[PDB]
Amino acid sequence: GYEVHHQKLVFFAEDVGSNKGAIIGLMVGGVVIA
Amino acid sequence: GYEVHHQKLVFFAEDVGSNKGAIIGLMVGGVVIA
Amino acid sequence: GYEVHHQKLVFFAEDVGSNKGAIIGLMVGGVVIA
Amino acid sequence: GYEVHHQKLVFFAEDVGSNKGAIIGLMVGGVVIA
Amino acid sequence: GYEVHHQKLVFFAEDVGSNKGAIIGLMVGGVVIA
Amino acid sequence: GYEVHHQKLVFFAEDVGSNKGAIIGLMVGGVVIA
DSSP: OOOEEOOOEEEEOSOEESOOSEEEEEEESOEEEO | OOOEEOOOEEEEOSOEESOOSEEEEEEESOEEEO | OOOEEOOOEEEEOSOEESOOSEEEEEEESOEEEO | OOOEEOOOEEEEOSOEESOOSEEEEEEESOEEEO | OOOEEOOOEEEEOSOEESOOSEEEEEEESOEEEO | OOOEEOOOEEEEOSOEESOOSEEEEEEESOEEEO
8 A cells, every 4th residue: 555654844953042033934924024 | 555654843853042032933924023 | 555754854954053134944925124 | 113014814715615524724733534 | 114014825715615625724744634 | 215015925816616635725744645
């Protein structure tokens, strides 16, 4: 038959330090003022 | 038949330190002032 | 039959430091003022 | 300064009649057997 | 300055009749068996 | 200054009738068995 396994989807895979703006993974519509 | 298993979806996979702005994973519509 | 496994999709694979603007992974529509 | 107004986000903008399956607007994770 | 207005994002703009499967607007992760 | 207005993003702009499979607008990760 079929077999689908172990897919993987990462947006940010390491550290996110000292952010002072906007960090978005997925954004559908909308405004970002940074 | 079929078999679907062990998919994985990560947005932030490591530390998030000293944030002073906006950190969003998924955002549908809406405004972000940073 | 078929077998699909171990695909991988990364957007940012390393550190994101001292951001002061806009960092987006996937953006469908919408405005970004940076 | 800045001014952001009158954005609009619609998922289904017209009639939804005689549904016999699954109609979802936004789905994060989860299984749908239809 | 800046002015952002009257954006618009539609997923389904007309009728959805006699559905017998799966109709999804936005789907992040997850399985759909139709 | 700047002015951004009246953008528009449509996924399905007309009727969707008698569906028996999977109709998705935006899909990030995940399996679809149809």
